[PDB]
Amino acid sequence: TIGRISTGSKSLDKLLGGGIETQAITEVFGEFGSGKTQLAHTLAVMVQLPPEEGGLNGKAMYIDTENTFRPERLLEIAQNRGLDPDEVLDNVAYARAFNSNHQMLLVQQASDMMKELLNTDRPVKLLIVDSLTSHFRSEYIGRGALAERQQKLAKHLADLHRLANLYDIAVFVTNQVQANGGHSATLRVYLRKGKGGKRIARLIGEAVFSITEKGIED
Ligand SMILES: [Ca+2]
């Protein structure tokens, strides 16, 4: 549907109101193996497709903080969906965020890059930040550092929301459930492991999906 990227699952798209939205931040929470990273890799392929096939004829940028990006997985999803894998890999730009300060600087650097590429036929339409809070949690420790950590995270989310609106891109971020917090910034989706190997998504009703050779499916 209009301005949305399909997840690869019709059930998950229905729950999301058609898929992930441009000009917005979608935040997916869950433990390791819940489907969050698999969903990010599938969306990096889906965004490239025409709108009738659930994409935006776009490119993706994947920012990693905990070594989760797998080009071979994109290659596999592309091959299994009948798409050209070299084209798919050429359209997903990868950058590692080394620490929380660098992670925050990457938003302005991505903004500078998208600006110069304004005339391009295939613009970036999806920005993924996998494990959004990992560097903030490991660099701000002790009870006294919590307020500062939250303040820096809020500023980072505000910079991402501004990026989504200046370039009409979908921002997709992954995180883990927090004992304290907190959004204001988003659309929050919790992912769980289901029976057998299915995964369940819930908005913070519910939708069932699976992890296959094609990435995310029903
Ligand atoms: Ca996963």
Author numbering: 109 to 283, 289 to 295, 307 to 328, 336 to 349
Tell me what the authors wrote about this structure, in their words:
We focused our attention on human RAD51, an ATP-dependent recombinase crucial for homologous recombination (HR) and for error-free repair of DNA double-strand breaks. We therefore explored the possibility of using a more stable orthologue as a surrogate and focused our efforts on archeal RadA from Pyrococcus furiosus, a protein that was already structurally characterised and is closely related to human RAD51. Here, we describe the complete process of generating robust, RAD51-like surrogate systems from this archeal protein via two distinct approaches: by stepwise mutation of the surface of the RadA to humanise the BRC4 binding area (HumRadA series of mutants) and by generating an archeal/human chimera (ChimRAD51) in which all of the BRC4 binding part of RAD51 is stabilised by parts of RadA.
The humanisation series could have ended with HumRadA22, which displays a fully humanised BRC4 binding surface. Nevertheless, we extended the humanisation process further into the oligomerisation groove and “behind” the Ala pocket, in anticipation of the inhibitor design process expanding beyond the core of the FxxA binding site.
